[PDB]
């Protein structure tokens, strides 16, 4: 499959997707690409981001399919990874990904963390996995970001000063997406 759109799945919280963080700027930049689309919608259950709510929304309302690049931020990165356990997607770009509820009640209530990660299913369903992470992220232990990188064999873009990626512009992400639009050579991953 060749990629036809990106979908931004944001972090949890009530910020309007179009005007909060980098989502709107990235959408606008991607929409400059001739023939390309970028969907970004306010999510149902935006505060707790329940798996049982976000994943059906991603399927039916964001139309996430084998021609989609899913760009997931924080809770949205988590949702992207669970989505890829059961759906083929073109690529996933994970910004501030992690693996556990980090002892947070709102994270636990999401349902994303109540069983192990099906890393092999994700790798099988998604041929291109790119990851952004920052060592100074105030929410995430580096070890959990590293766990995602190791288990999904991601192409890791490791920064020291981006925190939880909450700035308004994100050029490095545009570059990544444009690189994926060329349908780059498949890299060797380990499938079990
Ligand atoms: N998941 C939150 C960030 C967060 C991570 C871990 C614990 C608490 C909060 C977000 O989407 O922004």
Numbering used by the authors: 2 to 193
Excerpt from the paper describing this PDB structure:
RBBP9 possesses a classical α/β hydrolase superfamily fold, and its hydrolase activity promoted tumour cell proliferation during pancreatic neoplasia. Despite multiple efforts to characterize the cellular activity of RBBP9, its enzymatic function in cells has remained enigmatic. Finally, we develop a pipeline to directly identify the branched peptides formed between a substrate fragment and Dap and thereby reveal that the putative serine hydrolase retinoblastoma binding protein 9 (RBBP9) is an aminopeptidase with a preference for removing aromatic amino acids in mammalian cells.
Collectively, we demonstrated that RBBP9(S75Dap) preferentially forms conjugates with individual hydrophobic amino acids. Moreover, RBBP9-mediated hydrolysis required a free α-amine, as acetylated Met–AMC (AcMet–AMC) and the dipeptide Glu-Phe–AMC were not hydrolysed; this explains why the aminopeptidase activity was not detected even though a subset of protease substrates (for example, Pro–pNA and Suc-Phe–pNA) were screened in previous studies. To understand the preference shown by RBBP9 towards aromatic residues, we solved the crystal structure of RBBP9 in complex with Phe. The overall structure of this complex is almost identical (root mean squared deviation = 0.17 Å) to that of RBBP9 alone. Phe sits in the RBBP9 catalytic pocket. Tyr99, Leu103, Phe140 and Leu141 form a hydrophobic cage that holds the bulky aromatic ring of Phe in position. In addition, the hydrogen bond formed between the α-amine of Phe and the side chain of Glu108 (or Ser76 or Tyr99) anchors the amino group at this position; this explains why a free α-amine is required on the N terminus of RBBP9 substrates.
